[model samples]
Target: RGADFDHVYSGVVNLSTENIYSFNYTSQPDQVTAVRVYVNSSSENLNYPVLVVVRQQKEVLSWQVPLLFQGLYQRSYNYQEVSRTLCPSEATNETGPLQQLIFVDVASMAPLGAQYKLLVTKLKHFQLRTNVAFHFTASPSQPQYFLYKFPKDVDSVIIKVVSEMAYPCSVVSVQNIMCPVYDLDHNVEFNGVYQSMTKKAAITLQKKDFPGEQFFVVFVIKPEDYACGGSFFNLQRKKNLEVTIVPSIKESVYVKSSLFSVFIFLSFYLGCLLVGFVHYLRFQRKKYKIYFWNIITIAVFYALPVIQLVITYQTVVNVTGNQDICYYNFLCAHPLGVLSAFNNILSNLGHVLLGFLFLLIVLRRDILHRRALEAKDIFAVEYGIPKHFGLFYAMGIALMMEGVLSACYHVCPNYSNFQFDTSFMYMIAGLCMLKLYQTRHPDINASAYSAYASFAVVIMVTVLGVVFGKNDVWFWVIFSAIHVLASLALSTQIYDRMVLLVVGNLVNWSFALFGLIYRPRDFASYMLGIFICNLLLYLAFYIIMKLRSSEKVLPVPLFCIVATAVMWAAALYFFFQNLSSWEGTPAESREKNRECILLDFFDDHDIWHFLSATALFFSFLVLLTLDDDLDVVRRDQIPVF
Candidate 1:
């Protein structure tokens, strides 16, 4: 051959700064590129970090001999031991003389984190390798740090960085992340970004798609990133650390047992609706009064307590993030103090309204007043009521006291999760049963339709409220108080018969509202009690409606059998559907659109929701409509001894 290639390019290599910025390499036919520089600092000793590199750029000249620059003098060069790739590949001698070198001035790159000045510019080509580190100068300089790690509570230390993707094509080159976890140990991840020399670019991390704890992350950038020069060291710090602990406050396991109390209640209620409606056809309407409305009434009323819980839950989960809750509004202290004070006042407004209606109607002689007067009672002569209105009033006060305590116990220390069920649900259930049959309750806004609507509202509130519970107590206090008030309004009555029908049911509403608190053993017991109660009530309804004289009375054993059957059937259905569900299913859903009574062939304004509700209404209408019919029948019948 006429001539051989030079191993080193010309020009002296020295700069103002002692630290080297970057060093990466490409390989040749038999050899590879290697570089080194030094770093020093007064702070803690830095770990020996190794970084990978790929070619940034390359412009190949003719295969024939071409000039390659070796070194330059400028702050841009940064006095770094650059990768040894400027020499020609086919150099004749192992130890060769230096060739001509060129120094290219640099430009300030805003897009890059730091300024960029061309350290060297010449035609050079080499195949790149991965993860190879080039040594750098021994110069010392680094950032301050108290410990290798960061703050105690802090999860990780973020390493500032800038990076650019590999540019100049090489025989063997790869994209970013071609290499991973270069230096750090466990729990540390890396994210890198690429940009021009001067300005910062987007920084990416290996943990991009990952979520949850990020213990630590080390971010890196390009160019200077090769060979640990631009590497930002990172590692994880503390994880879950408890500041304090308390164990005594947890409620009894029994209190939490049968976590799906509401579910069982609702499911049973839905099943009752389904079967009761199916059996309440036109042919069965009259017969249903004997047994059907009993089922529907229980089913409908059973759902009210469950609804109250749902409403409270929705308020908490939707409004607040805190889970531990307490509200004085209905309990120990007033939550949203002024607002609760106002709502309590509003709750009584329903009572005021109902009391007024009672006075107006009872005082009117022209109104549909009760006949056969001549009472031997105290201070009242409108129309011979129970000879028991005073007693009902006393009973009502007793019921209200019970209700207040029940509400207090449940809402005392509130919780987002469904835990306190028995104390609360039973209290309401008891009140509802009492009102519909036994006693009266206060602040009950229960009209026939209002009861249905309110029941639905309660269910909706419970289902959504618990999930979105915001941990605020005041919200629930206002809502709960409002519901009780509504019940009170619906239970108003002026006549003895009406009082037993409506006011008693208002007590039922109260008991049902509080019944949602049933849990585990108590939940099961309450469910059984409810089924039995409904069965008995329906049987009594049938006997009262279809019978007149003592001999005409339905046999006690027969009524008991029917009642027991109703109770068992309801119990079986409830267990079947809700053995697993947390909350109960809807009586009807969009999926059951065809099942809607409105859409059914039996649907008529007179029929109501289904044969069940229709049967109930029809039964009551008949007793009223047959006053003259009953009198005629009684007269024609033989006189009993």
Candidate 2:
């Protein structure tokens, strides 16, 4: 481009002053071959002379370039500057000029440093057709969440950004390596002959389709276009710039078989419904409506992920896996990394939003009444925090907390599982509260499906919790850590409602699960028996309460009891026994077993669980009263609007 002219002209008068640029590309199409550039700025500014210095570094390979972009260089204007290029590809697979990100640390190439200057211009020749089209989206609409599903047989690239890409406060820019700039905003999704494209750029994502799902994309058409903005481009250009998509490839992701039987979908769904009901009940006093949106949001978030996990099958690796594992790296499927990068901005933004949610919850009339009178509220009152905040705010709070805790828990590897467990349980517990709330208030009556859904969720959580523990420590840890981190981070709020209570329980759950899953079961009997015993006791409680006590249990004990029993049974069977040696109980031993806590040096499943359970019980007790005065219901008459 007219680099020298821009340097010289500056604020010069409008007299007869002009600028020029010259370019000489010194590479063969066969050996040092083709090049092309896609520009994104003022089409008018493209008028300038170009000087291309073709030096093969310290070697003696050099040459001049052809006159290709003469039209833009002669009379430039009247366009969005999304793109201007040379050498369009005829074949789909052909990519003549393979560009890449070559950092400039070695500007002083070889033994001696050489001086060089680059002019901003489009590479005039490349064998490229629009590559692959990748579309990614998330359900429950995680602001930062991105669904990465890569395409196949890509030759060129045309990026569309509904939001920022990969990172927050970051920009994207695309260049063909001819102009003085690859970017003005400098955000680039990318185009290249990847050292590993199968993982980095090949992977893309899509959610289980919902009603009226509008797919959003942030496209990079112009090289120096504005960041985080949307616009259109040429038809030819639009189709021409798709990345080189891998052909005849599978993009679907399936959960591992070992991990699939971990969680119960029916239970998971029920849990979400219940959580919504809780919101309805807690906020019932204020002429509030149960919904409306949160009902949808929570359901989507829970159901989609659970389904995905259950269907979690693996594509064969590139050598061993496939493109679904990564956009560039196929050796390992790292959806977490991709999702994290995509949602970075939204995650940060959520922090600010979550603070506002807490404010709303703490200000609930009923909740505030207790806080004001008792100095602190009890479970029943506190649990209704979601109701006061309204479903959306409450759900938003959960989503934000998810991001915060996930990030923090990952800070250290040791306690990460705890983080996952706590987060998961909190979510599930929130569901339970919702169910109870709905059941308690006929005015806030939920559909039969919704109530059934909540019970299903409890069952699912218990089962998956155990299943996750059985198969792998990492799965258990990550999931558990996510659970704890989300719950704990949100715990600082003014409301101690059921959701937070669940979080507290999650802390203990993770505390024990980490031990239960991480260690071998050395106790004379499986911990499953203990859980079964508890289940029986709870069943007894229900029978005794139903028969003996004239008072109703604040909430039904059946759901919890059944969930614990089934999950414990599954956990005992799947978790402890190796796949090959499942079902048989070990012979009795006369050996005296030592006991230590989860954090203690001893790491046996039985002993660790015993201590962990004790610790968890105490922790649960502390949280048992975490939410008091659960926003008492006022059977007051509704005033005419």
Candidate 3:
């Protein structure tokens, strides 16, 4: 038997039209034959291309020529070199050596001859020790391969690969044969854990992941031609590779913590449900009728969590087996059986809790207002705009749904399911605008069917924007036209005076044109811009109308409004600090992930959930109490905002 690591041949080959080099070596099971070839930089025609084909003795038959010829054309390179590995299928006997033949050929069509250097090495079974750092340099012409046997007592193994050079390298581990560095089709099937242009790649392998006792690790320099920033001119470069294998006897404790967190949040949600049910019983005997739509909205809001829990359970049961189906923050991810990202899902508790709390507050306010009217302290028929709990109830449900849908989204976060998290958010904004208008003009306010239909259209447009907003000029043109027309139509409904309507149209058209001219690729940002712009315009109109009518808001509601603004500012800041994006590749999304920041249990996105929930609660409070001062005034004397 030859040495475990021996340089078998090193020499220069001169080629005109065709040249063949043959070598014979005794074969053994679990051994790899590595062949490296490169053109000398000092060659007269440095840019001259040459095709190199390597085949086994058995592949020289007439039936195997097509396969051999395919490899010949695909392996052709100019200044850049090539490296390939081959493994024997048969085992050798001690008494009779198993001989294997490998032939290398340089087939070139250059009128003048070309010269190149070639080197070959034999790699045998080598086991890497645990917690030991093995270092080597890998050039474009040569790929490094090794094997590691797992310790019997270890339950998991963590393989870490680091490089110092700017050029990236690929690291792949598999159970059976050597890594397929040269076979392009096989390489795609056994994709590397870290194939991006980065200096670090790591993977954790459990004992159950592989069937065998050991696995092979292959380190190869990624060719510049396949890189995102490749150029015509090839440059010879080398990267120093460092690899370490860490053995773990136990799993991470975060997995247990994740289960505990889910249990804790579920208990809290149940408590909210119990409290809400108690209030519902108490309100059943009240004098004022809770509007039909408001009751239905709250019922659905309460049912949403239960439905989401079932969907999440099914998703985790089926999808976690294949981690690639979802984009998860593995750095902070605590995978417990089927739940791949439990922390993210648990952070949605804020919405459920706050939503019930807001509903309870609205119920209490409804009771107080009914008592005041019955006691003759405030006149219902003659005083103030008609108070309606329907929109407020819907808004509360929207807040709760935002949290439920967000959790459902995080269960299997990806491009296809991203709309689940955002759909309710758009509803919340639309509902707020509707409630603001209804506060001043209850009679002429949009009907529930019309309002929801408008929301459906907005959601549909947003979906299209997300799918085609990046580079589709046709989508932008159509979207712009719709936006301009809708804005003008809404203005007509809001303003009765011709001068005011004309002024509103001018402002709306100007903003629409600005958006058209400076189109943004981010659909979320574009929608948010329109939301903020319309919100400010409506709020300004409300304030101006109040001033014109010599009316003022009560101090308590004004304070609530101020607090809501501050909370929103903070929430938007956290919202902009995106934790992940579905628009890019999974690797790109992972780059934005961070470790848990709150009690080692939550990330920045979780904070957004909590802050936005609180902000929405405060905003709803302002709507409920904004017209308290008009309770004693005659309805005919009040002016609509």
Candidate 4:
């Protein structure tokens, strides 16, 4: 079998109206099969018209094209028998090289200057067919670095004999691909898909994701996954293959819309603050001090995401080899893939904001109960102090961290088991609720209940994580259902029928999650719309049941229900608009669907964030107004301003 080969020659060229740059090359007769030219410009003028001429003997080929692009411009030519070939029909493979001249004509007399880079590739038929393998031995004096080079035409390679837990390897351009500083705190090995391996190892990476023509491949051997771990492999002994070559492959991408989505969200934020301030002023009194807790909540509310954003930016900077690979930033050049990052933030924010409503209730507990609980609670619960207030405190803290961590993940996906870890915290909150409820129902032994709940959380989280690597949509649906059931079960005695109806409806929609398998983004749109519809349906039925059975409808609860219903509808509209803008690929539409950009601070995704936030806001208002007496505490116990 003949070994396939590709030889590349590249150089930087600047063309002015005065100097017509000429490139000369020689190709052996009957030896070369194909040729390609790649031109790129950083000044964004690569798209302008350019003329090219190739002359060999009497064979002259000329063509003109508008080479518009910023990153890449590619063209390929195949060798033809009589017309396209620069060599004679009877030419032998060993004959003298056929000389050719390539003229790059800027052809602009009154034109702007353009600077460019050229990459030329010549494909050939003959090379050695060889099988290669390397043995990895951990030795301080042994050579730690190895470069495997092969013919460019080869498709893939298998790496084996890895003696470490993780097989970390990088395939980069000979000079351009930056070698990451080896560190565990930083997930330097952040590219390509990897599957687990053992026993001779079947490690494989394709050339498509890399940006270089000739790859400088290297493997990392660590005693442990972290840098500080013992038993590190230092370069010393081993086959030094500086002159070795490796086989390689290529793939391309292209994106737009202008809307500041984050701006819309921020507008809502400031607007809400103004309304809240006006309401506070109208009702201002010594009682206004009661909202100091709420004020603090508002202050810390946006802090977490900003912190996560900084973390994500640094992480991506450390890891991203190319910006185009991630869809969120294909249109603009930025480290934060706005669409992807905000999706996590908004989703987690919904959960956290809802949890905050419950937190406010817990914090305002009656002074007597708080004193009684503190008497039994405190840190001694871990020892012998009766755990009461401490449990609720931990519960709220866990929920807040859960949201923060989930958002952090979107910014930096390198966190090991971040999804599973985030979901596991929710389970812990459920156990806390179960323990607290056990105190209200003396018949249910708190010890046994606590024991059982702890076991259940661990087992369920483990099982869920195992079944679905990350919760994704499927796991989240299950997670929500479990928490709802746990909350209801723990507070059964005080649980309101209305609360049950509403939370139950939300759970039911989540159960319909199986629909996501066929289409993720499309199915998510339907789910959002359907979720709103179902919530309204639940409200309609609840209203009917109340009217038929009640002597009179409570005004505040009724108002909340109506307002929440309106917000749900608004949320659906926002989602539809958000989908139109953010959730599109070139394959799906002429251009990626229009996404939201409000002023300059947000993207279509930011709109969805605020949209969902408003719905959650109104829904939380309904929850707050409901018969939350089961979990409510005296308002006076909470601090004043």
Quick one: best lDDT, which candidate? 3
Taking every candidate in turn, the Cα RMSD to the unseen true structure, in Å, is 23.9, 22.8, 8.0, 20.7
Q: What is the TM-score of candidate 1?
A: 0.22
**Pick by TM-score: which candidate is best?**
3
lDDT per residue for candidate 1 within 200-259, as digits (tens), equals 111112222223212121211222222221222121111111111111111232133223
Off by over 4 Å in 3: 1-9, 12-185, 188-325, 374-376, 379-384, 495-518, 543-550, 594-597
For model 2, residues 93-163, the per-residue Cα lDDT tens digits are 35554332211111111122222223234333222223334343211101111112222332112232222
Q: Write the residue-wise lDDT of candidate 3 on 82-162 in tens digits.
A: 454553334435435467666766554445655454554554424567999988766545455666767898877766666
lDDT of 3 at 137: 64
Candidate scoring better on lDDT of 2 and 3:
3
lDDT of each: 0.27, 0.29, 0.60, 0.37
Q: What TM-score goes with each of the models?
A: 0.22, 0.24, 0.66, 0.36
Residues 1-641 of candidate 4: C-alpha lDDT, one tens digit per residue: 11112322223334444223455556566443233333333333434434444443444444332222121123221111001112222225666776655443323222565444344434231121325444333211111223333346654443333323222221221221333312121232454322111111222334444454223333322222222211222112222221123221121110011223334334545664675577678856630222233323432542454464556555554355422122332121112233333433544564455445445544544343456457864322222212234344434444555556545544543223223223424333343334333333324433433434554455455444444534276655565565456534533443346655566546554545443343233322333343344444444544454454332345656676777777666655655543221233211221232323543234454454445555544553443333232223333321111
Where in model 1 is the C-alpha error above 4 Å?
1-320, 323-387, 390-641
Higher-ranked by TM-score: 2 or 3: 3
lDDT (Cα) of model 4: 0.37
How high is the lDDT of residue 596 in model 2? Answer: 22
Summed backbone clashes in each candidate are: 100, 131, 0, 31
